[PDB]
């Protein structure tokens, strides 16, 4: 490998993080065994070999706010909400505020998952887009079920992290 990067995926249980982790992985969870899981994705961006490892932990929904200690050592975060659950979004705003205030060096993107059932959707696109806009971050709406916009989303965080690293060099 040429580069290694470490990602976190955060969000309420029931937002599809594990389905997203399945799409992420090269291969084919321990989340209900040791409360933690990691997946490995390898990708080539402009000839360069990159290995991404992403980490999830159990029961994150009980954290009103995920504090700065959680993010040490991490290059990038995928903050996931569920477009059919308004509470998953509110939490995600708190987390991205704490990130903005205490960890602005970390790349993060916002992700609205389960963009699959129109009849059940509650977080409107312009709302999330407006919040995304004011945090200076990019937003993706995805379906881990149908596999829609997921690759686009992963390639974004991957590119962000690769550029932060070269813009630091």
């Amino acid at each position: 490998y040429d580069h290694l990067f470490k990602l976190l995926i955060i969000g309420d249980s029931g937002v599809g993080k594990s389905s997203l982790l399945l799409r992420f992985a090269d291969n084919t969870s321990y989340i209900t065994t040791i409360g933690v899981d990691f997946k490995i994705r390898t990708v080539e961006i402009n000839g360069e070999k990159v290995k991404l490892q992403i980490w999830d932990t159990a029961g994150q929904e009980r954290f009103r706010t995920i504090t700065s200690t959680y993010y040490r050592g991490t290059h990038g975060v995928i903050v996931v909400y569920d477009v059919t659950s308004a509470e998953s979004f509110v939490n995600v705003k708190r987390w991205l505020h704490e990130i903005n205030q205490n960890c602005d060096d970390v790349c993060r993107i916002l992700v609205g998952n389960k963009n699959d059932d129109p009849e059940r959707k509650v977080v409107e696109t312009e709302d999330a887009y407006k919040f995304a806009g004011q945090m200076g971050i990019q937003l993706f709406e995805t379906s881990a079920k149908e596999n829609v916009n997921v690759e686009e989303m992963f390639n974004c965080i991957t590119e962000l992290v690769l550029r932060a690293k070269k813009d630091n060099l």
Partner: protein, 343 residues
């Protein structure tokens, strides 16, 4: 929100297994029709969370308690009795943190098996299994009654108790190592309990089995136990900055100086009490740590919590500490839990 124990589990325990060391073999389980295949695959590996090939014969007869964390981050306690020689292990899986009871029950099940008393065993299992979880006999841990604190305290130098405490209070990535699973899990459970009324909120694995060693590379805070026969493999991995305590020798290595960040008056009061003969019996040890917690976080008394009023102390050492304390997930869940109940 605060504690990592399931309040009202469905059952007194969920599974009992006799396992022997290809994977370990389940010889016998109750209930016979236990249906969660994910638990049936993982539990046997946690029964023998060491390099069996290399150190089986060094294993002494012992009791230890693994933990599996569920989807809600609640703890499933794996109470195990491992026979000398480390080839055979008896295991009760429960949400109830009943260490002393289940250790005794494991010995009684072992004696029923050796005396070939099958009915009495099935009766006892049945009756306790279908018994509604009893809330009455029908408080701070004390030494020697509570086995996790007692074994922690006898195995680990006072200085290292203080170091692990400080490291927890900076939500470090902590690995504890021992050649004894009894001591190992005991150190993890006993050290964590001394946070009371706060609880460790992140990765919590009292003993980590060989197939899961790569999890020591986690970037997030953690408290993880590793048997000594696996430490070389772990070290050869590419770890983040981690705090390691090898209980076999009471050797601590950490690139941080977290204990230096705690106010000296608190540390010397805690230290002086821990070294006092009489502290070594009854609730002295837990009370000492309880009192340290009070001195460090007690000023939180001051409905909402004002971070800037809490962080404003006169002494530079304490102000500095309080400014890091507000970033602790363990402190955050405690405050938020207390703001929830105050209504």
């Amino acid at each position: 929100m605060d504690c990592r124990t399931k309040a009202n589990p469905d059952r007194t325990f969920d599974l009992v297994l006799k396992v022997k060391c290809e994977d370990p073999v389940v010889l016998w389980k109750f209930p016979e029709d236990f249906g969660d295949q994910e638990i049936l695959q993982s539990v046997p590996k946690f029964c023998f969370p060491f390099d069996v090939e290399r150190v089986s014969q060094n294993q002494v007869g012992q009791h230890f308690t693994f933990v599996l964390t569920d989807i809600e981050s609640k703890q499933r306690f794996g109470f195990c009795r491992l026979t000398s020689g480390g080839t055979i292990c008896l295991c009760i899986l429960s949400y109830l943190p009943w260490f002393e009871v289940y250790y005794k029950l494991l010995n009684t099940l072992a004696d029923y098996l050796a005396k070939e008393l099958e009915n009495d065993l099935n009766e006892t299992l049945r009756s306790l299994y279908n018994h509604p979880v009893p809330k009455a006999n029908t408080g701070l841990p004390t030494i020697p009654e509570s086995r996790n604190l007692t074994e922690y305290f006898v195995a680990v130098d006072v200085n290292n108790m203080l170091q692990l405490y400080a490291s927890m209070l900076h939500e470090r990535r902590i690995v504890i190592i021992s050649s004894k699973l009894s001591t190992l899990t005991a150190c993890i459970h006993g050290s964590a309990a001394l946070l009371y009324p706060m609880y460790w909120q992140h990765i919590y694995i009292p003993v980590l089995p060989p197939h899961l060693l790569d999890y020591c590379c986690a970037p997030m805070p953690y408290l993880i136990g590793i048997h000594s026969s696996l430490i070389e493999r772990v070290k050869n991995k590419s770890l983040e900055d981690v705090v390691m305590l090898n209980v076999d020798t009471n050797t601590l290595e950490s690139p941080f100086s977290d204990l230096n960040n705690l106010p000296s008056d608190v540390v010397s009061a805690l230290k002086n009490k821990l070294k006092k003969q009489s502290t070594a019996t009854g609730d002295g040890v837990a009370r000492a740590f309880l009192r340290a917690q009070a001195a460090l976080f007690g000023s939180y008394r001051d409905i909402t919590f004002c971070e800037e009023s809490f962080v404003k102390h006169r002494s530079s050492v304490m102000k500095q500490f309080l400014e890091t304390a507000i970033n602790l997930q363990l402190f955050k869940q405690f405050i938020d839990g207390r703001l929830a109940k105050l209504n």
